[PDB]
Each structure stands twice: as C-alpha cells, then as structure tokens.
Design a protein around this nucleic acid. Structure first.
Length: 48
DNA sequence: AGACAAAACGACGCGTCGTTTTGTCTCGGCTCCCCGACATTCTC
C-alpha cells in the first residue's frame, strides 16, 4: 500500500520524469550552516 | 547496527486576516483692525 508522509522532499531533477521523483537529503550532506546579522543586531540562522 | 535528517508531539502560545467598536483637551476676560450684507440722505 502507498503510505503518505508530510514534509519537505525535493525533486531529483528537471528532465523527463525526473521532475516527479522526490528524495530526501543524504546522510552527512548538510555541510553548511549560515549565521547572518541584521543592522539591529539579531542573529539569523539557515541551513543551505 | 550507526548516527544523521526530519517528522511528530506539546500545551502553549503567540501572531493574523476581516470586521466592529471605541476614543478623540476645556473654559474665562477683554482690545482693535479689516471686510461683508441690509436700511436713510446726498452727487453723478
């Protein structure tokens, strides 16, 4: 049976039927974590 | 099996669109300039 999950999955590619395949980031591939500052002074965080 | 990626849980919790309702400084004395309108007389 097809079980469904709610989350963030991205397309594998943009050609042919690749635009219909949704995958999850591999183990140990979240390598960069950006720390920003606004002119006031608060820190903002993001993971690219 | 390991350890990363992220979904799931929590009560909690604060933000958010769409509209309605609410709140908003107050009175006293005078003086002296100007103008407007409406009545009378007088000149043209």
């Amino acid at each position: 049976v097809r079980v469904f999950e709610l989350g963030s999955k991205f397309q594998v590619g943009q050609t042919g039927n690749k635009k219909g395949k949704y995958v999850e980031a591999a183990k140990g591939t979240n390598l960069f974590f950006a720390v920003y500052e606004d002119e006031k002074g608060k820190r903002s965080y993001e993971t690219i």
